Amino acid sequence: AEQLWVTVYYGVPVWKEATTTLFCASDARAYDTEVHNVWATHACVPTDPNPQEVVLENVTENFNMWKNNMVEQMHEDIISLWDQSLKPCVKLTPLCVTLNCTDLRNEGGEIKNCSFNITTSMRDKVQKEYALFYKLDVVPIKNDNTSYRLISCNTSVITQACPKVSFEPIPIHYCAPAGFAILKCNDKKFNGTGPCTNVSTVQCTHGIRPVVSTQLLLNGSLAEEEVVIRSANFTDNAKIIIVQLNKSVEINCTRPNNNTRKSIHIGPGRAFYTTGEIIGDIRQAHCNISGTKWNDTLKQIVVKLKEQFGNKTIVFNHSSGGDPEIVMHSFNCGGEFFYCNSTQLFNSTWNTIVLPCRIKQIVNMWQEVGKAMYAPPIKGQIRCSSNITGLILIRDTEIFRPGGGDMRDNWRSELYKYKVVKIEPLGIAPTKAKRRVV
Amino acid sequence: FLGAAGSTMGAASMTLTVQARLLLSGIVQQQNNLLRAIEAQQHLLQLTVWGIKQLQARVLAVERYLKDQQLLGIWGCSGKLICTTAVPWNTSWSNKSYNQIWNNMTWMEWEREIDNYTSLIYTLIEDSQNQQEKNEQELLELD
Amino acid sequence: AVGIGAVFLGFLGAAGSTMGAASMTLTVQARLLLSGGIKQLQARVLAVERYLKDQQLLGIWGCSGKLICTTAVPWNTSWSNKSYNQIWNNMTWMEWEREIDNYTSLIYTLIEDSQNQQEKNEQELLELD
């Protein structure tokens, strides 16, 4: 027949999977004027995107929510955003001093205010002091009568965070650089892995508020009007149960103690702060959930927990194991840290709740062992309403307990749709044509 | 090289015979001497505030050069200076008459006349001509 | 307070379409390939260093500045058992670049040194008359 010759094409719409660098592209309003928002790092890239979207309608791309790289690039960056911000603030090495702590006039908690001699920046004469110290940060030392010492002296350094900054979790949109198209599944029956039907293409991902909480997920993002629950093997016992429920469950948590301002001794140009006085009467902080909807919720969960084996033996159980930082429910609220007891939330089922919250001050970094941030609060009481669009469970009559040791799994619940592919725009094909040759 | 920024469009094409006043030639006679290797005769001696800024300066010299070659490269107008196309001008873009655009007008005012409409013209060259002619050329090689 | 539907095309919009429908779409994937705390800068060079390579390979093949072009290199039916009209009317590109992935290195050597190297020694020596 005819002779065929190769023919070069450019801009051919193909891709392979690649692992490249994405970049922050945040909000850009009210970042100026004292907003040292540590998530924004003063509005990281000021884009405020217009997230357009192109449907492709003939494309099947075999996704995977479990071998995704985008969740790995967050957990690199978030502690990396801490580390530059943890640097210039005040170091707290010279404070690990033996104490004399007595009972405070209006349980185990704030009973002990303390006193110790220190000579930080004057470097001439020591001076005793008065502070306010909770539990969960002190140790009654040996061979002495009522003498305390901070729990994390002989770890790495105990640098605090500065009061200019704010940990306010504004939504961050991950955009893609040139030559990379972030894709997104358009099927809401997407169970986590496998193929999709009519994958689209966005410039930039949707709202991701990088909140930090164990055992739940607060200001999250929720699917349509079925409850979807995904996991890795979903038969294996030591995996993580990602729960996406179709409605929100409203939460109130408050700190009724009128904590105030304060003046503690100065480092070298470094004023250090330790929580000033309460107004004179102590009410212990608590979360406060509308317990009807929560009771309504968990029977709705075993509707969709069930349909992978039989029609029998569903229960709910509370957590277990170790010190209360991994036991009790952890989350932040506006420059303040909460460890709340959540044993009441996990009664079993069949086919207004007040929770005792606990607050500490010396708080470990989230995954590294070693350094640890620190922040005394601002004046007044604290209130933050919130939401719930998910929780983290484990397998163990088939026992479900609230597990959790990685908020990447929270970010896996946020990024269960996305995939970044590089363009290989050059391509060739044969036809009958031929270059003119003389 | 901006010597005729107050001249008119019907007259600035006269002096544009010089290579846009040797536009790109000023870059190569710069980067021959921007690439004075005294930077390598020091290894900058450190990382300094200027070398951070020079690094962010050379990138924009790289990128914004490419965005002007690529758009000339895709338009079937690679490397030329005055090329015609096959796209018909639509009077909805500008209802100015002929001589007013050329004889009686600056350049930068004419930018603000069609800075709205500019992006539509970009697509209406490629998908109308340079995407299009390549298929019709390849049909004329099928025989 | 804005919004209208699609007019021309989207980015990667033809990537589920056939070849005969995607061949009129190449410019949108051609424009946005280049434009789009050090770790932005390390991206801003890789995006350049990938663009030059694809630009360079078109340059060697006598096919720089054109979006499409033809050569005189013969297609070898050992590379594809696919029929002709199945390719231009049924197969998408994303599938197509899994099928000729192995042969790609043979192709690129058999463009330059085959023809466009040879179309210069033949070209230079068509003088003297």
Partner: antibody, heavy 134, light 109 residues
Framework: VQLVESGGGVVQPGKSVRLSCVVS????????MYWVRQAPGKGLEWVAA????????VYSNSVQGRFLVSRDNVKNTLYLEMNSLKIEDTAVYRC????????????????????????????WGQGTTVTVSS | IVMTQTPLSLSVTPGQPASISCKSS???????????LYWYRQKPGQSPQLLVF???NRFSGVSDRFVGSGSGTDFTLRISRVEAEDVGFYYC?????????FGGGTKVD
């Protein structure tokens, strides 16, 4: 400038009229328009909107599909035609101009889709009134 | 979206400052860099007239004592030394997206 309407009055259910707002002096093809409905003793309800080139039309959900709007940039007119009339449509209609100027449509590069910008109003016509009853 | 306001009735006399706020459910900040909330006034029996277009700027024929401010959700219009002819209603009008709604219109006597 001068901004009034015409064709108002009173009709029955199931009927169909068309008003006529006429502008005076500004370049009419440059600007988009609107329609608003103040019920007697109530607040205001937005009705409709046209682009400047008469290409983009956005209706309220309640009057969706029933009404009709159009432009004539040469005759500098503005029409609100209506169909399938109900008694609760009895209110004051007002013709109204956008405050700002609008541009041509935008055509974002990344997806071949134009964009018509829409902002609010400054010049309300005094407007006619249509009553639907027996 | 939903956007109501408060208080409905402020039957006052001239000589004092006060303010009228309009409360937003959806936050307003368009990607142009501005918050499309338009405050204006009708008189009884009249088609309305523009008081201020943006929450920052004003309109022609407007006394200087008409000041407005607000966040993306909080929105406030303040009238210093409330003038004798401040009768009728005061509608808060937003321009985020469609259908763009109103407030009830605060009556001031």
């Amino acid at each position: 400038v001068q901004l009034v309407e015409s064709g108002g009055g009173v009709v029955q259910p199931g009927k169909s009229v068309r008003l006529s707002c006429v502008v005076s002096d500004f370049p009419f093809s440059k600007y988009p328009m609107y329609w608003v409905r103040q019920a007697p003793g109530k607040g205001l309800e937005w009705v409709a909107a046209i682009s400047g080139d008469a290409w983009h039309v956005v209706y309220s959900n309640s009057v969706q599909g029933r009404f009709l709007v159009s432009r004539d940039n040469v005759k500098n007119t503005l029409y609100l035609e209506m169909n399938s009339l109900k008694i609760e449509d009895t209110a004051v209609y007002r013709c109204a101009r956008m405050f700002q100027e609008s541009g041509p449509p935008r055509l974002d590069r990344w997806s071949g889709r134009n964009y018509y910008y829409y902002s609010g109003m400054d010049v309300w016509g005094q407007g006619t009134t249509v009553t639907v009853s027996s | 979206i939903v956007m109501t306001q408060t208080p409905l009735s402020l039957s006052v006399t001239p000589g004092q400052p006060a303010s009228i706020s309009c409360k937003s459910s959806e936050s307003l900040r368009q990607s142009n860099g501005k918050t499309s909330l338009y405050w204006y006034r009708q008189k009884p029996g009249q088609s309305p007239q523009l008081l201020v277009f943006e929450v920052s700027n004003r309109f022609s024929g407007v006394s200087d004592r008409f000041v407005g401010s607000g966040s993306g959700t909080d929105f406030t219009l303040r009238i210093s030394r409330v003038e004798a002819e401040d009768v009728g209603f005061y509608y808060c009008m937003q321009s985020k997206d469609f259908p763009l709604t109103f407030g009830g219109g605060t009556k001031v006597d």
